[PDB]
Design a binder for this molecule. Structure first.
Ligand code: FES
Ligand code: FES
Ligand SMILES: [Mg+2]
Ligand SMILES: [Mg+2]
Lengths: 570, 570
């Protein structure tokens, strides 16, 4: 599709295609005077200008180290004969905001980050970009900006956090999230609870397991938009700083080849990213982010594309949440390149795709050490953890425009039960606390948590933990138009579309309606007749929006459905 | 008005009204684990958390020093017994982008900055904010965020740049903008031109005269949202770092009083800001930014309010662009507090308004040194530069919803001439180059440069300089639905509403239509009959938008008219 967003270069083989707009014409003397004031010499004006976009801030572990990484990227850009100009956008902490109304601001931060980087690159006429995200929503935001601008770019992942260790126990952020419920159930004492909180996050880096950040870092490496090993080198590893110092050398080569994001992000490399998500058991959130990335380069990517790749790619990796190990253990067995080399050898990946190294994926992977002999993290193709991928698309009566579930295969094939409907997370949690037994056998519906109804499509962790804490994990099902962070050991479906705020069938369910989930048929159905459902829709009125001003009201005005990746600029 | 945007504090006299949402409940153990990982002790969890939002980036003189200022703010916050968490948003350089399509991204950056700070403060549950903007659009963006959140906040202006000096000549960014035209006219040699560019911007700080940055810094100080002297201390002055180190002490007192932005930004303090703009000859851009600030706190502010204050307040200050001196000279004669003390003594200002010092404006100004004896920058009330303010609101046939002009009083009372219409800056400049004499006596209309048509309401400097370079300054008039950066010595009107993209009368003007500007009647009229104008409107079709994706398409979808301050969140 013909994306029209950002300025075109003035009208070659020059390396400063964009910055020449302001450094060369005498009519841009004001621009050149500012550039002299910031320290550029006349000779520096002849060089390419690289925008170095970090997402540093001090109040989150995933982002507090990124200013140090940005300094290393700048040094490397200068060492490559170019001008490096650092800038920095916002981000938010999913781990801090989880459980609170601040989570309404998280998903849209991806789109704000994309707008932020697009704005600076366009106004300042930078020739290329190196982005340094370190947290969940940051990663896709930086790629989406690169796709809109279509200027040479590289994403340097800030790296994963290391697990915490204390007194021969290991902890991560998920240990800290689970601490409260374990204390309420009497599984741990208050003092043991406090010990978890002091040792779960030991330093810088993104949350430690195969959750959204590590899913997206790995997928973006598989897509060719990060250098080999970026996704698997830990945040505090000296090799991460070395990658930062090399990004300028690689970007220089991309400027010489004019190898741009829309030359790298293609239908085949989007498929390669999706293959990595299925093989590694990555997060359902990658559906939203990979759709948004595809749209940013003018391509199409639908829920059905995800179902087809899921069916074609087995789940192979024993990594948390589903499994035992964490990202740092992948690092020790050869890293993301070793994993992708195996998937390429199995024929699951397209090796001809160009990448930010200036060569193809197959050329990158030809030389990397293979998975360490004897490793038990990546299963052989003949003994997979699941025959197909975890990610499942469900439609049917109640999700006619789609929905997304993580299906391990241990939940069974079907669930049927009467609906128990809540207009938000708070009322569901109050009910399961006051009367957990009323939840046994039900299909729990938490609605009004979609892109517009939330607002902001918040991710919710407490409902699954509350259900497991009450002993109900395999005894009820959970449905939302929002997102769920965890599994329950039972059926858990998010992203239901249309959302309740938009008058989708989820907004018409009544307590007691019999809902049946059929994984084989890929349907979430209701025993209520289509005619009675249409009767309810004729009487339905959309509730008032929860905001009338500020960034979230703009989001309500702009956001597309979850099946459309919640893009905001169409 | 009942603004609903951001989270409410959990339900006092505590100083951590918001951060207690995440530091106190056992159910927020994940939040506390992240906070330990970023370095907070158990005792630190009891403290207020201050979001310190800077707009640092390396590629603009107005912003390159702001990371150093942010470190000083953090030290002062810690010295005041609180936790300081730095974060940083984007900005763009009007001086670099001027003359290019990158300028389409400038005005909307104000609204992106507001969204950015709102997002972080909300997701992270910070109790208060100290913002450090240093450039044009940054300032109102930070205040708009503070107004939405209504949490205690202080804006620390990054400070003005100093004029450049070389070989007994003085230069500023405007010298550099004018260099090309002077070279084309043969007024200066190419070597003299190059010398201007090397000496116009000597260090850090916002553009040096009473242009938008210094207008807004002064207005925001007059509004009570910056500490005394913030607007007049130069960026490179040691006293600016001292102000940074004191902001935490003042913010602590605001948390103790719960003195919030909506307690400080009121109809009376908005009027005080407007008084400072009129007395100092500040930029027409302040109309857009002060309207947006008023809306952010749920207040009303219209073009007619600006006309009433302009009529009530004389233009008193001999400052560039209109005058001789620059901001650093105001600093030497007692600074912005001395100016405001004089305006308060004259009865032009409401002294009872509360400010970020925890006291009223009158209490702040009681002790400040008055304007230095013998100073000739601020005229006495009995000998003003202009009896009323420079800012004039014009309506009439062609701007029925309003427009904004800077009127010195030396242009005369009326202009009439045939219309010469251009669909953008490029075609106007091509025409004045190829045939300057065809412009003599005309009313030049540059349309399609509005919020949606530009897109982005770009500010245009070249048309006025081209008109003066051709010797036509007092021989034609200039009208736009966009914005003009400079004066021409003749009639120059911007912000014409409705804009051409919206089918306003400006979009129906044809070459040769007789247009009359009447300053006394405050009207821009056409000799074309209302019936023929309505005939043209019935045949008019809106042109296609110039973008279909990215941040500027979102802006097109969200932005209100210039008469409504180009707000995006309503
Ligand atoms: S909060 Fe950053 S990846 Fe979890
Ligand atoms: S570009 Fe920053 S105030 Fe002029
Ligand atoms: Mg996510
Ligand atoms: Mg402005």
């Amino acid at each position: 599709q013909s994306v029209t967003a950002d300025p075109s270069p003035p009208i070659t083989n020059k390396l400063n295609k964009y910055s020449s707009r302001i450094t060369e014409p005498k009519s841009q003397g004001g621009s050149q005077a500012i550039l002299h004031g910031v320290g550029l010499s006349d000779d520096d004006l002849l060089k390419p200008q690289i925008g170095i976009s970090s997402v540093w801030y001090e109040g989150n572990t995933c982002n507090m180290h990124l200013l140090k990484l940005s300094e290393a990227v700048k040094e490397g850009v200068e060492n490559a004969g170019m001008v490096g100009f650092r800038f920095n956008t916002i981000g938010v902490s999913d781990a801090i905001s989880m459980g609170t109304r601040g989570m309404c601001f998280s998903l849209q931060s991806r789109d704000l980050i994309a707008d932020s980087i697009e704005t600076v690159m366009s106004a300042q006429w930078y020739d290329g970009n190196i982005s340094i995200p370190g947290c969940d929503k940051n990663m896709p935001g930086t790629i989406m900006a690169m796709g809109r601008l279509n200027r040479p770019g590289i994403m340097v992942y800030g790296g994963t956090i290391k697990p915490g260790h204390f007194q021969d126990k290991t902890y991560d952020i998920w240990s800290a999230f689970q601490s409260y419920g374990e204390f309420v159930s009497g599984s741990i004492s208050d003092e043991q609870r406090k010990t978890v909180l002091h040792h779960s996050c030991p330093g810088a880096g993104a949350c430690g397991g195969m959750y959204t950040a590590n899913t997206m870092a790995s997928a973006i490496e598989a897509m060719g938009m990060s250098l080999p090993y970026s996704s698997s080198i830990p945040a505090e590893d000296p090799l991460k700083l070395d990658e930062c110092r090399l990004a300028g050398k690689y970007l220089l080569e991309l400027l010489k080849m004019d190898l741009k994001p829309r030359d790298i992000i293609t239908p085949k490399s989007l498929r390669n990213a999706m293959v990595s998500v299925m093989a590694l058991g990555g997060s359902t959130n990658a559906v939203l982010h990979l759709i948004a990335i595809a749209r940013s380069v003018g391509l199409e990517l639908t829920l059905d594309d995800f179902q087809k790749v899921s069916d074609a790619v087995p789940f192979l990796a024993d990594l948390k949440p589903s499994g035992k190990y964490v990202m740092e253990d992948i690092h020790k067995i050869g890293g993301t390149p070793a994993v992708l080399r195996y998937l390429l050898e199995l024929g699951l990946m397209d090796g001809d795709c160009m990448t930010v190294t200036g060569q193809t994926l197959a050329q990158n992977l030809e030389n990397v050490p293979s998975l360490t002999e004897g490793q038990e993290i990546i299963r052989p193709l003949s003994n997979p953890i699941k025959e197909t991928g975890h990610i499942q698309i469900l439609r049917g009566d109640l999700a006619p425009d789609g929905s997304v579930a993580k299906i391990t295969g241990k939940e069974g094939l079907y669930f049927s039960g009467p609906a128990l409907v809540f207009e938000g997370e708070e009322s569901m949690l109050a009910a399961i606390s006051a009367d957990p037994m009323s939840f046994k056998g039900t299909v729990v519906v938490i609605r009004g948590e979609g892109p517009k109804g939330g607002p902001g499509m918040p991710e919710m962790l407490t409902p699954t933990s509350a259900i497991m804490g009450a002993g109900l994990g395999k005894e009820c099902a959970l449905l939302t138009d929002g997102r769920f962070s965890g599994g329950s050991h039972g059926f858990v479906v998010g992203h239901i579309c249309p959302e309740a705020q938009e008058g989708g069938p989820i907004g018409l369910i009544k307590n007691g309606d019999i809902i049946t989930i059929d994984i084989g048929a890929a349907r979430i159905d209701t025993q209520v007749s289509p005619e009675e459902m249409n009767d309810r829709r004729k009487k339905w009125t959309a509730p008032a929006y929860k905001v009338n001003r500020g960034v979230l009201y703009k989001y309500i005005k702009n956001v597309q459905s979850a099946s459309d990746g919640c893009v905001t600029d169409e």
